[PDB]
Amino acid sequence: RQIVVGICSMAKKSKSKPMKEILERISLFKYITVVVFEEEVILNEPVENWPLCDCLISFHSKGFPLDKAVAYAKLRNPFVINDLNMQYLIQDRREVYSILQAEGILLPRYAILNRDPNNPKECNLIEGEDHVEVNGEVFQKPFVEKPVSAEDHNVYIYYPTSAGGGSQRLFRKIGSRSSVYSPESNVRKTGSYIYEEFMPTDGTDVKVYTVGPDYAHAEARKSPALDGKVERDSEGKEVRYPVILNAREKLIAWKVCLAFKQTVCGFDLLRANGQSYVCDVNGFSFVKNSMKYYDDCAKILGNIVMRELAPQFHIPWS
Ligand SMILES: O=P(O)(O)CP(=O)(O)O[C@@H]1[C@@H](OP(=O)(O)O)[C@H](OP(=O)(O)CP(=O)(O)O)[C@H](OP(=O)(O)O)[C@H](OP(=O)(O)O)[C@H]1OP(=O)(O)O
Ligand SMILES: Nc1ncnc2c1ncn2[C@@H]1O[C@H](COP(=O)(O)OP(=O)(O)O)[C@@H](O)[C@H]1O
Ligand SMILES: [Mg+2]
Ligand SMILES: [Mg+2]
Ligand SMILES: [Mg+2]
Ligand SMILES: [Mg+2]
Ligand SMILES: [Mg+2]
């Protein structure tokens, strides 16, 4: 009997180039068969009708019925690569930051402003022209304002008077741009936000991609917060810069992977003030346009599957 690896995610993810490149490589494992769950089945069929698997790779993105994935895993009890219940928490920046703190992982100093939907101005935010006070905690500009929903990428940065004031409004890339300047200096007045201290980097973000706690690919890209113009290469892809993680950062990746129980895990690091701060944990994410990552990721995942399941299948594995 072949060991079945089931892939359960939205078609946009399951049919992405990185996914296809990696699944083709996992399929090279002699005793592993890959089954990709059709999106129509995921959305419209009860979990009792979903394909069987022995190892489940499943992850939430927009429109994914996480409730069904959880029910499926409870019904079939497969070996789960990326924990499903943790994926509820990953959708909430407050829950993400709570986990990071609990694990002794450096992150920006932050405060949560929750607005009870029924009451607009019954909250504890005091605003000055160059600072905010959130539940009594002071944040001098520059500071960062993030929607509590991790799926909401409308992150704002507020400039001090000394730099001309106003704000930088980040958003999901639309064409050539990832942010825009706004003359608006006052914070958003509806919704719930995390406020945090701006960490000064060299103008790049470090993107980290784990495959288990002992493997992490990192690369850097221009921070959207600089001017907002996306750097693109001749082929039209966003420019990336080489990164090698130092010992502290490799430990960070180990902690993030295990703490969130996401074997495959993407997160952001800000290299600032001689340290590295996690500002975002996204969960399941593959590196794009790296053949070597495809090779490495497929090999590691296949090895994890074999290590875990080969005994019960009576397959030799050393
Ligand atoms: O390159 P194109 O414009 O064709 C697509 P884009 O580059 O916007 O891809 C983003 C990706 O952004 P990044 O460039 O890796 O920062 C996201 O990554 P971020 O979460 O922004 C990683 P970051 O937080 O910037 O480090 C995440 O990609 P993935 O990681 O899920 O593959 C998104 O997927 P989703 O969040 O919309 O489901 C995906 O958007 P989509 O492909 O759906 O249009
Ligand atoms: N505390 C911070 N200090 C400086 N820059 C930040 C901070 N938080 C976020 N940023 C910048 O804003 C970008 C988006 O923030 P992030 O928390 O990664 O949100 P998203 O989940 O939308 O990716 C980051 O890639 C980084 O460039
Ligand atoms: Mg095979
Ligand atoms: Mg995601
Ligand atoms: Mg992004
Ligand atoms: Mg991010
Ligand atoms: Mg994010």
Short mmCIF file of C-alpha atoms and ligand atoms in Angstrom, two decimals:
data_model
loop_
_atom_site.label_atom_id
_atom_site.label_comp_id
_atom_site.label_asym_id
_atom_site.label_seq_id
_atom_site.Cartn_x
_atom_site.Cartn_y
_atom_site.Cartn_z
CA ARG A 1 0.00 0.00 0.00
CA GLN A 2 1.20 3.47 -1.04
CA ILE A 3 1.31 6.26 1.54
CA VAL A 4 -1.20 8.89 0.40
CA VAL A 5 -0.38 12.58 0.82
CA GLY A 6 -3.55 14.66 0.46
CA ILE A 7 -3.37 18.33 -0.51
CA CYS A 8 -6.38 20.32 0.65
CA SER A 9 -6.53 24.03 -0.23
CA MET A 10 -8.22 26.45 -2.63
CA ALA A 11 -7.44 25.89 -6.35
CA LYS A 12 -5.50 29.20 -6.56
CA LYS A 13 -3.02 27.63 -4.12
CA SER A 14 -3.24 23.94 -5.16
CA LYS A 15 -2.65 24.81 -8.84
CA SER A 16 -0.01 27.51 -8.22
CA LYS A 17 3.33 27.03 -9.99
CA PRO A 18 5.26 26.48 -6.71
CA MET A 19 2.71 23.90 -5.55
CA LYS A 20 2.83 22.04 -8.89
CA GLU A 21 6.65 22.07 -8.92
CA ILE A 22 6.80 20.68 -5.36
CA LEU A 23 4.06 18.03 -5.74
CA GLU A 24 5.73 16.69 -8.88
CA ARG A 25 8.91 16.28 -6.80
CA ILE A 26 7.12 14.69 -3.79
CA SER A 27 5.58 12.20 -6.25
CA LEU A 28 9.14 11.01 -7.08
CA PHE A 29 9.12 9.27 -3.68
CA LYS A 30 8.66 5.57 -4.50
CA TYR A 31 6.12 4.88 -1.73
CA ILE A 32 4.23 8.20 -1.85
CA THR A 33 1.13 9.00 -3.92
CA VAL A 34 -0.11 12.62 -4.00
CA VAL A 35 -3.84 13.33 -4.16
CA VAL A 36 -4.95 16.96 -4.72
CA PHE A 37 -8.50 17.58 -3.46
CA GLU A 38 -10.62 19.39 -6.09
CA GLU A 39 -11.92 22.80 -4.97
CA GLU A 40 -15.51 21.85 -5.94
CA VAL A 41 -15.23 18.82 -3.61
CA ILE A 42 -13.75 20.98 -0.81
CA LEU A 43 -16.55 23.57 -1.07
CA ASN A 44 -19.58 21.49 -2.03
CA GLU A 45 -19.04 17.91 -0.77
CA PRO A 46 -19.43 16.88 2.88
CA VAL A 47 -16.12 15.78 4.45
CA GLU A 48 -17.33 12.13 4.51
CA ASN A 49 -16.93 12.18 0.69
CA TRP A 50 -13.46 13.76 0.56
CA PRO A 51 -10.58 11.53 -0.61
CA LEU A 52 -8.70 9.50 1.99
CA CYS A 53 -5.10 10.35 2.87
CA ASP A 54 -2.52 9.23 5.43
CA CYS A 55 -0.79 12.60 5.59
CA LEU A 56 -2.73 15.84 5.13
CA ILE A 57 -1.23 19.10 3.88
CA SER A 58 -4.03 21.63 4.23
CA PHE A 59 -4.11 25.38 4.76
CA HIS A 60 -6.46 28.31 4.86
CA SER A 61 -6.54 31.16 2.35
CA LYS A 62 -9.46 33.41 1.27
CA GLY A 63 -12.68 31.39 0.90
CA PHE A 64 -11.29 28.18 2.41
CA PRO A 65 -13.71 26.29 4.69
CA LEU A 66 -11.32 25.70 7.60
CA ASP A 67 -14.24 24.26 9.62
CA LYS A 68 -14.54 21.45 7.05
CA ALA A 69 -10.77 20.78 7.00
CA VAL A 70 -10.82 20.44 10.82
CA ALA A 71 -13.84 18.08 10.64
CA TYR A 72 -12.11 16.03 7.93
CA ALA A 73 -8.94 15.68 10.05
CA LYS A 74 -11.01 14.67 13.09
CA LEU A 75 -12.91 12.08 11.00
CA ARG A 76 -9.87 10.54 9.29
CA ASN A 77 -7.06 11.23 11.81
CA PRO A 78 -4.25 11.70 9.23
CA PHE A 79 -0.74 12.87 10.06
CA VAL A 80 -1.18 16.67 9.78
CA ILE A 81 1.81 18.70 8.43
CA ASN A 82 0.36 22.16 9.20
CA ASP A 83 -1.91 22.19 12.27
CA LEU A 84 -5.43 23.30 11.28
CA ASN A 85 -6.75 24.80 14.54
CA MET A 86 -3.73 27.15 14.77
CA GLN A 87 -4.86 28.53 11.41
CA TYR A 88 -7.84 30.23 13.10
CA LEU A 89 -5.38 32.12 15.31
CA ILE A 90 -3.07 32.98 12.39
CA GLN A 91 -6.00 34.96 10.90
CA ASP A 92 -5.91 37.34 13.89
CA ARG A 93 -2.82 39.56 14.39
CA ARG A 94 -3.59 39.84 18.11
CA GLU A 95 -3.37 36.05 18.49
CA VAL A 96 -0.18 35.94 16.39
CA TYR A 97 1.57 38.55 18.58
CA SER A 98 0.41 36.78 21.75
CA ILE A 99 2.07 33.54 20.61
CA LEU A 100 5.29 35.34 19.62
CA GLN A 101 5.53 37.00 23.07
CA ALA A 102 4.78 33.74 24.88
CA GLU A 103 7.71 32.16 23.00
CA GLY A 104 10.28 34.83 23.86
CA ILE A 105 10.48 36.00 20.23
CA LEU A 106 11.48 39.64 19.73
CA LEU A 107 8.69 41.69 18.14
CA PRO A 108 7.87 45.42 17.95
CA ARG A 109 6.56 47.01 21.15
CA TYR A 110 2.79 47.06 20.62
CA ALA A 111 -0.66 47.82 22.01
CA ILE A 112 -4.10 46.61 20.89
CA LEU A 113 -6.99 49.02 20.31
CA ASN A 114 -10.24 47.05 20.29
CA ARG A 115 -13.40 48.88 19.27
CA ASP A 116 -16.65 47.29 20.44
CA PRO A 117 -18.67 47.61 17.18
CA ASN A 118 -21.62 49.05 19.14
CA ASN A 119 -19.50 51.89 20.56
CA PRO A 120 -17.35 54.07 18.24
CA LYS A 121 -15.77 56.56 20.68
CA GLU A 122 -16.04 54.59 23.97
CA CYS A 123 -12.47 53.29 23.48
CA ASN A 124 -9.13 54.27 25.05
CA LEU A 125 -7.22 56.05 22.29
CA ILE A 126 -5.76 59.52 22.82
CA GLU A 127 -4.23 61.22 19.81
CA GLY A 128 -1.61 63.95 19.65
CA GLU A 129 -0.21 65.52 16.49
CA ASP A 130 3.04 63.44 16.93
CA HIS A 131 1.92 60.44 19.03
CA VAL A 132 -0.92 58.18 20.07
CA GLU A 133 -1.70 56.75 23.50
CA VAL A 134 -3.35 53.34 23.45
CA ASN A 135 -4.65 52.05 26.79
CA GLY A 136 -2.17 54.54 28.30
CA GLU A 137 0.85 53.36 26.31
CA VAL A 138 2.62 56.05 24.28
CA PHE A 139 3.75 55.58 20.69
CA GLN A 140 5.75 58.43 19.20
CA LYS A 141 5.69 58.76 15.42
CA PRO A 142 6.82 57.00 13.41
CA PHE A 143 4.42 54.20 14.41
CA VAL A 144 2.55 51.45 12.56
CA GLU A 145 -1.17 50.74 12.53
CA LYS A 146 -2.35 47.25 11.53
CA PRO A 147 -5.91 45.96 11.16
CA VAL A 148 -6.46 43.07 13.62
CA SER A 149 -7.53 40.88 10.68
CA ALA A 150 -4.33 39.33 9.29
CA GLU A 151 -6.09 39.10 5.89
CA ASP A 152 -6.45 42.89 5.84
CA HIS A 153 -3.22 44.29 4.35
CA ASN A 154 -4.20 47.96 4.79
CA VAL A 155 -1.29 48.68 7.13
CA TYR A 156 -0.60 52.39 7.72
CA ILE A 157 2.59 54.11 8.81
CA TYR A 158 2.40 57.58 10.43
CA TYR A 159 5.27 60.05 9.89
CA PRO A 160 6.41 62.53 12.58
CA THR A 161 6.03 66.30 12.05
CA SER A 162 9.84 66.45 11.66
CA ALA A 163 9.54 64.32 8.50
CA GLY A 164 6.58 66.26 7.07
CA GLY A 165 3.74 64.35 8.75
CA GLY A 166 1.09 62.49 6.78
CA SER A 167 1.04 58.72 6.38
CA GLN A 168 2.05 55.82 4.18
CA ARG A 169 -0.85 53.53 3.23
CA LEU A 170 0.18 50.00 2.30
CA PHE A 171 -2.10 47.61 0.40
CA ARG A 172 -2.18 44.43 -1.65
CA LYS A 173 -0.01 45.11 -4.72
CA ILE A 174 -1.96 46.68 -7.54
CA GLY A 175 0.26 46.74 -10.60
CA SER A 176 3.39 48.79 -10.00
CA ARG A 177 2.57 49.94 -6.43
CA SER A 178 2.46 48.53 -2.89
CA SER A 179 1.84 51.77 -0.96
CA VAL A 180 0.95 55.43 -1.39
CA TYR A 181 1.57 58.61 0.61
CA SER A 182 -1.41 60.35 2.19
CA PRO A 183 -1.39 63.86 3.66
CA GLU A 184 -3.66 62.46 6.44
CA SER A 185 -1.89 62.56 9.82
CA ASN A 186 -4.71 61.32 12.08
CA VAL A 187 -5.23 57.61 12.76
CA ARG A 188 -8.21 55.62 11.49
CA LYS A 189 -11.30 56.16 13.62
CA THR A 190 -13.34 52.99 13.03
CA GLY A 191 -12.20 49.36 13.37
CA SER A 192 -9.78 47.55 15.67
CA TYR A 193 -6.01 47.96 15.31
CA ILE A 194 -2.63 47.02 16.65
CA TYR A 195 -0.35 50.04 17.16
CA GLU A 196 3.37 49.36 17.18
CA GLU A 197 6.78 51.04 17.20
CA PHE A 198 8.35 51.56 13.75
CA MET A 199 11.53 49.50 13.43
CA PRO A 200 14.14 51.24 11.24
CA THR A 201 15.56 48.76 8.71
CA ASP A 202 17.92 49.42 5.80
CA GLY A 203 14.75 49.75 3.67
CA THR A 204 14.16 46.03 3.09
CA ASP A 205 12.05 43.29 4.71
CA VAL A 206 13.45 39.80 5.23
CA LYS A 207 10.99 37.08 4.17
CA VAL A 208 11.48 33.68 5.81
CA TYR A 209 10.03 30.38 4.61
CA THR A 210 10.35 27.30 6.81
CA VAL A 211 10.10 23.66 5.82
CA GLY A 212 10.15 22.09 9.26
CA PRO A 213 12.01 23.72 12.14
CA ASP A 214 15.55 23.06 10.76
CA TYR A 215 15.19 24.52 7.26
CA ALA A 216 14.46 28.13 6.40
CA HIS A 217 14.93 29.97 3.14
CA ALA A 218 15.24 33.75 3.50
CA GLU A 219 15.28 36.58 0.93
CA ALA A 220 14.81 40.37 1.09
CA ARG A 221 12.57 42.80 -0.78
CA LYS A 222 12.19 46.57 -0.76
CA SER A 223 9.87 47.61 2.09
CA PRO A 224 6.46 48.70 0.67
CA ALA A 225 6.65 51.50 3.25
CA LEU A 226 9.55 53.32 1.51
CA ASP A 227 7.89 54.98 -1.50
CA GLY A 228 5.55 52.22 -2.70
CA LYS A 229 6.97 51.65 -6.18
CA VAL A 230 7.50 47.91 -6.73
CA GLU A 231 10.95 46.99 -8.09
CA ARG A 232 10.59 44.62 -11.05
CA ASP A 233 13.20 42.71 -13.08
CA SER A 234 13.42 42.28 -16.88
CA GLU A 235 11.03 39.31 -16.76
CA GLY A 236 8.55 41.39 -14.71
CA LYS A 237 9.07 39.65 -11.35
CA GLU A 238 9.64 41.59 -8.12
CA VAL A 239 13.34 42.13 -7.34
CA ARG A 240 14.62 40.05 -4.42
CA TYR A 241 17.91 40.26 -2.55
CA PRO A 242 19.97 37.36 -1.13
CA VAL A 243 19.78 36.73 2.62
CA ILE A 244 21.55 34.25 4.88
CA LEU A 245 20.05 33.97 8.35
CA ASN A 246 22.41 34.34 11.32
CA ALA A 247 22.27 31.95 14.30
CA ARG A 248 19.69 34.06 16.17
CA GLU A 249 17.45 34.16 13.12
CA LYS A 250 17.69 30.40 12.49
CA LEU A 251 16.50 29.94 16.08
CA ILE A 252 13.65 32.41 15.42
CA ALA A 253 12.57 30.27 12.44
CA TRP A 254 12.73 27.10 14.59
CA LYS A 255 10.56 28.77 17.27
CA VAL A 256 7.99 30.17 14.80
CA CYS A 257 7.58 26.84 12.97
CA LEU A 258 7.04 24.90 16.22
CA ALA A 259 5.05 27.52 18.13
CA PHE A 260 2.50 27.84 15.29
CA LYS A 261 2.69 24.10 14.45
CA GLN A 262 3.10 25.04 10.78
CA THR A 263 5.77 22.83 9.15
CA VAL A 264 5.60 25.06 6.05
CA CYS A 265 5.56 28.61 7.43
CA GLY A 266 6.18 32.07 6.06
CA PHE A 267 6.97 35.05 8.27
CA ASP A 268 8.61 38.50 8.10
CA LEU A 269 11.70 39.72 9.93
CA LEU A 270 12.76 43.31 10.42
CA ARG A 271 16.51 43.66 10.81
CA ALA A 272 16.77 46.72 13.01
CA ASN A 273 18.99 48.04 15.81
CA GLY A 274 21.30 44.99 15.71
CA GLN A 275 18.43 42.54 16.26
CA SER A 276 15.69 40.84 14.21
CA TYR A 277 12.01 41.36 14.97
CA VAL A 278 9.08 39.23 13.72
CA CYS A 279 6.26 41.49 12.51
CA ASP A 280 3.99 39.03 10.67
CA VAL A 281 3.43 35.24 10.67
CA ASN A 282 1.47 34.11 7.61
CA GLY A 283 1.56 30.33 7.90
CA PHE A 284 1.66 28.15 4.77
CA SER A 285 3.70 29.77 2.00
CA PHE A 286 6.11 28.52 -0.66
CA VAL A 287 9.08 30.39 -2.12
CA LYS A 288 8.41 31.44 -5.73
CA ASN A 289 10.84 31.05 -8.64
CA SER A 290 13.52 29.03 -6.82
CA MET A 291 14.24 25.60 -8.31
CA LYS A 292 16.52 24.79 -5.36
CA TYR A 293 13.70 25.59 -2.90
CA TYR A 294 11.37 23.27 -4.85
CA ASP A 295 14.03 20.51 -4.62
CA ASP A 296 14.70 21.08 -0.91
CA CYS A 297 11.07 21.52 0.13
CA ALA A 298 9.86 18.37 -1.66
CA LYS A 299 12.77 16.33 -0.26
CA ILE A 300 12.14 17.52 3.33
CA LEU A 301 8.37 17.00 3.15
CA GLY A 302 8.78 13.53 1.61
CA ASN A 303 11.33 12.64 4.30
CA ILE A 304 8.98 13.86 7.07
CA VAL A 305 6.16 11.70 5.62
CA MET A 306 8.40 8.60 5.36
CA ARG A 307 9.91 9.10 8.83
CA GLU A 308 6.45 9.39 10.39
CA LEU A 309 4.54 6.72 8.48
CA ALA A 310 6.99 4.13 7.06
CA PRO A 311 6.98 2.04 10.28
CA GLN A 312 3.19 1.45 10.23
CA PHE A 313 3.33 0.71 6.48
CA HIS A 314 6.24 -1.71 7.12
CA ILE A 315 8.39 0.21 4.62
CA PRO A 316 12.17 0.22 5.22
CA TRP A 317 13.41 3.72 6.05
CA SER A 318 16.74 4.86 7.52
O1 LIG B 1 3.10 38.67 -7.71
P1 LIG B 1 1.74 39.01 -8.16
O2 LIG B 1 1.27 40.40 -7.98
O3 LIG B 1 1.14 38.18 -9.23
C1 LIG B 1 0.81 38.30 -6.75
P2 LIG B 1 1.48 38.88 -5.15
O4 LIG B 1 2.93 39.14 -5.30
O5 LIG B 1 0.61 39.94 -4.59
O6 LIG B 1 1.31 37.53 -4.28
C2 LIG B 1 0.73 37.58 -2.98
C3 LIG B 1 1.85 37.33 -1.93
O7 LIG B 1 2.64 38.53 -1.87
P3 LIG B 1 4.23 38.58 -1.73
O8 LIG B 1 4.61 39.21 -3.02
O9 LIG B 1 4.71 37.20 -1.57
O10 LIG B 1 4.40 39.47 -0.55
C4 LIG B 1 1.25 37.07 -0.55
O11 LIG B 1 2.29 36.91 0.43
P4 LIG B 1 2.28 37.80 1.76
O12 LIG B 1 1.35 37.16 2.74
O13 LIG B 1 2.08 39.22 1.41
C5 LIG B 1 4.01 37.56 2.33
P5 LIG B 1 4.66 38.98 3.19
O14 LIG B 1 3.71 39.14 4.32
O15 LIG B 1 4.64 40.11 2.26
O16 LIG B 1 6.00 38.52 3.58
C6 LIG B 1 0.34 35.84 -0.61
O17 LIG B 1 1.03 34.71 -1.24
P6 LIG B 1 1.27 33.29 -0.55
O18 LIG B 1 2.32 33.59 0.46
O19 LIG B 1 -0.05 32.93 0.04
O20 LIG B 1 1.74 32.45 -1.65
C7 LIG B 1 -0.87 36.29 -1.47
O21 LIG B 1 -1.94 35.31 -1.44
P7 LIG B 1 -3.27 35.66 -0.64
O22 LIG B 1 -2.78 36.25 0.63
O23 LIG B 1 -3.93 36.63 -1.54
O24 LIG B 1 -3.98 34.37 -0.51
C8 LIG B 1 -0.44 36.58 -2.92
O25 LIG B 1 -1.56 37.17 -3.63
P8 LIG B 1 -2.39 36.40 -4.78
O26 LIG B 1 -1.39 35.46 -5.35
O27 LIG B 1 -3.50 35.75 -4.06
O28 LIG B 1 -2.77 37.49 -5.70
N1 LIG B 2 6.84 47.57 13.30
C1 LIG B 2 7.20 47.85 12.02
N2 LIG B 2 8.25 48.67 11.76
C2 LIG B 2 8.62 48.96 10.50
N3 LIG B 2 7.99 48.48 9.41
C3 LIG B 2 6.93 47.63 9.53
C4 LIG B 2 6.47 47.26 10.87
N4 LIG B 2 5.41 46.43 10.71
C5 LIG B 2 5.22 46.27 9.38
N5 LIG B 2 6.12 47.00 8.68
C6 LIG B 2 6.20 47.08 7.20
O1 LIG B 2 4.89 46.90 6.65
C7 LIG B 2 4.83 45.71 5.87
C8 LIG B 2 3.49 45.00 6.08
O2 LIG B 2 3.33 44.66 7.46
P1 LIG B 2 3.00 43.14 7.88
O3 LIG B 2 2.88 43.14 9.39
O4 LIG B 2 4.00 42.24 7.22
O5 LIG B 2 1.52 42.98 7.24
P2 LIG B 2 0.97 41.95 6.11
O6 LIG B 2 0.35 40.85 6.93
O7 LIG B 2 -0.07 42.79 5.39
O8 LIG B 2 2.13 41.50 5.27
C9 LIG B 2 6.04 44.90 6.31
O9 LIG B 2 6.51 44.04 5.27
C10 LIG B 2 7.06 45.96 6.66
O10 LIG B 2 7.70 46.47 5.48
MG MG B 3 5.52 8.21 -5.90
MG MG B 4 -1.89 33.13 3.70
MG MG B 5 3.29 40.81 1.09
MG MG B 6 3.94 40.72 5.80
MG MG B 7 0.78 38.91 6.84
#
